[PDB]
Design a protein around this nucleic acid. Structure first.
Lengths: 102, 67, 225, 118
RNA sequence: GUUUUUUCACUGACCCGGUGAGGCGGGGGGGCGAGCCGGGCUCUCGCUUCUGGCGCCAAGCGCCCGGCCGGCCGGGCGCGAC
């Protein structure tokens, strides 16, 4: 009549993930006009360790194509990426490591 | 009298006219909130029967109940 | 004369080369839920196979004829709230010391004089929101031989009466002088609605796709020829 | 004219200010913490009478709601005297005790004759 | 014709994903290739890739428009940014 461990795991409180020191959501950059029709250049700032992820992450600081601000995206660091490497993203971007394209 | 013409027109809900009007409004009413003020009765005619006079102080809400 | 310092300093709005200018984003705005709602209602009217009892309020009296009917309908203003007081000073002149013709407003006091045949013409408004108030009325006037005409605006028909909106407007009897204009309005109305109502009954609205979906069919026609 | 931002933010509509057709309460409720109602009684304790003769102060028992500013007028208004500073502690009894240090242009032991403590 | 009905794509409810709902779809102006003796067309690209800088709040070119004594002291509106 006691609930099994898996059923208790589904609830939360105790079996939830420890997301305190997690260095952020590893996601790509959002699609816009500078992704779909051409490319955009953004520099790799620093390869970083995410607690609770085997692979490292990369703070790749792109220039904002619309605003005066400068945007920063947490990519999954490709093997052979380094700091100050130019990573180009979009349709017309080249086919080499880190260089994301559709 | 205008009301009797709307009366039997609301009894042919199966009609081509009312399979459009009850279908495109049932679209419209899902996109508005669960419980909000209607500016008027959708049916002036039906609200006539149930005692709604169209004077100041009478309020008509349009609320949805999950089926 | 000229200043050689005044230099052309142009911008290169190519992708990535320079920042983008403050250009038109009106058609990429996240609109309020009510503005989005009323717009893609007007769109569903253009897609869904609208039945011809509702579509007959798209066949409207044109620009040139509408103002002619309003011109004669402006003669027949039902009296103002302050014009009401000016009749009961012409009263105790005769006591202490016939009526002129007007418009008849609303759906009740029109449709009670369509079966009665006491309307020489009916003026329908096209944008009654709970449409069922009027849907029957174009059909009603076809049977009783009253010429019905449909206008663009219930507010502008509500201007003739001293109110916000008015659904329908009828002509009972008119001034014996001004029968000519009233009778010539009938022939252009009677021969554009009543003489061809069986054509209006087989007249379906909507069933027109999006203009980029319509413009993709053209691509699939220009590839096989 | 074009929408410069892709977000429809609510337009800044005009608002009017409260023009009352009647005041909610008939009159303003009077200041119940008067200069008499704020200082209850001066302490005539040997420790208090020491503090008056040794440190140029007075020891009053003050209403628990009082600031150090309200007392600084309360002792000024009722005793025609000036204040250097006020040091308020709430006793274990639950009442406030103001150590009203008087400025040296006046005498503390002499004004203790005026208030009538010995 | 009318319905039962397998099979393709249609969008329009309905669901999902992103966004600070920032350039979507047609069409044109403007550059690369193709065919006829300045000519009118069939389709392609539409601006940034040698380096851990810089880039926002427009220069430019148009046009009306405020005074005082056709010459002297500025703001606004369009392409630029179809």
């Amino acid at each position: 009549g006691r609930v099994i461990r898996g059923q208790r795991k589904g609830a939360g409180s105790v079996f939830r993930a420890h997301v305190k020191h997690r260095k952020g959501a590893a996601r790509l950059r959002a699609v816009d006009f500078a992704e779909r029709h051409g490319y955009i250049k953004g520099i790799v700032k620093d390869i970083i360790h995410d607690p609770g992820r085997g692979a490292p992450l990369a703070k790749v600081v792109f220039r904002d194509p619309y605003r005066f601000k400068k945007r920063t995206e947490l990519f999954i660091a490709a093997e052979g990426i380094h700091t100050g490497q130019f990573v180009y993203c979009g349709k017309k971007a080249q086919l080499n490591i880190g260089n994301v394209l559709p | 009298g205008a009301y009797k013409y709307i009366q039997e027109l609301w009894r042919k809900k199966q009609s081509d006219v009312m399979r459009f009007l009850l279908r495109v409004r049932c679209w419209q009413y899902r996109q508005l909130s669960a419980l909000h003020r209607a500016p008027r009765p959708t049916r002036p005619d039906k609200a006539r029967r149930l005692g709604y006079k169209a004077k100041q102080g009478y309020v008509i809400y349009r609320i949805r109940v999950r089926r | 004369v000229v200043n050689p310092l005044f230099e052309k300093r142009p911008k290169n709005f190519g992708i990535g080369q320079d920042i983008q200018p403050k250009r038109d984003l009106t058609r990429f705005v996240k609109w309020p839920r009510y503005i989005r709602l009323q717009r893609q209602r007007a769109i569903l009217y253009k897609r869904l196979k609208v039945p011809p009892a509702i579509n007959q309020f798209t066949q409207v009296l044109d620009r040139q004829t509408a103002t002619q009917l309003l011109k004669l309908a402006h003669k027949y203003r039902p009296e103002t709230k302050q014009e009401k007081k000016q009749r009961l000073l012409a009263r105790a002149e005769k006591k202490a010391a016939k009526r002129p013709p007007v418009l008849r407003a609303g759906v009740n006091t029109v449709t009670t004089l369509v079966e009665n045949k006491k309307a020489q013409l009916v003026v329908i408004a096209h944008d009654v929101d709970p449409i069922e108030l009027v849907v029957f009325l174009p059909a009603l006037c076809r049977k009783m031989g009253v010429p019905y005409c449909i206008l663009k605006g219930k507010a502008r028909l509500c201007r003739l009466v001293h109110r916000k909106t008015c659904t329908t407007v009828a002509f009972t009897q008119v001034n014996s002088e001004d029968k000519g204009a009233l009778a010539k309005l009938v022939e252009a109305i009677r021969t554009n609605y009543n003489d061809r109502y069986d054509e209006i009954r087989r007249h379906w609205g909507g069933n027109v796709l999006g203009p980029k979906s319509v413009a993709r069919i053209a691509k699939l026609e220009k590839a096989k020829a | 004219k074009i929408r410069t931002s892709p977000t429809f933010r609510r337009p800044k509509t005009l608002r009017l200010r409260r023009q009352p057709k009647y005041p909610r309460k008939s009159a303003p409720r009077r200041n119940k913490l008067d200069h008499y109602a704020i200082i209850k009684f001066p302490l005539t304790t040997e420790s208090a009478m020491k503090k008056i003769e040794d440190n140029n102060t007075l020891v009053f028992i003050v209403d628990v709601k009082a600031n150090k500013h309200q007392i600084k007028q309360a002792v000024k208004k009722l005793y025609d005297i000036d204040v250097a500073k006020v040091n308020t502690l709430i006793r274990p009894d639950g009442e406030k005790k103001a150590y009203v240090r008087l400025a040296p242009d006046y005498d503390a032991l002499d004004v203790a004759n005026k208030i009538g403590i010995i």
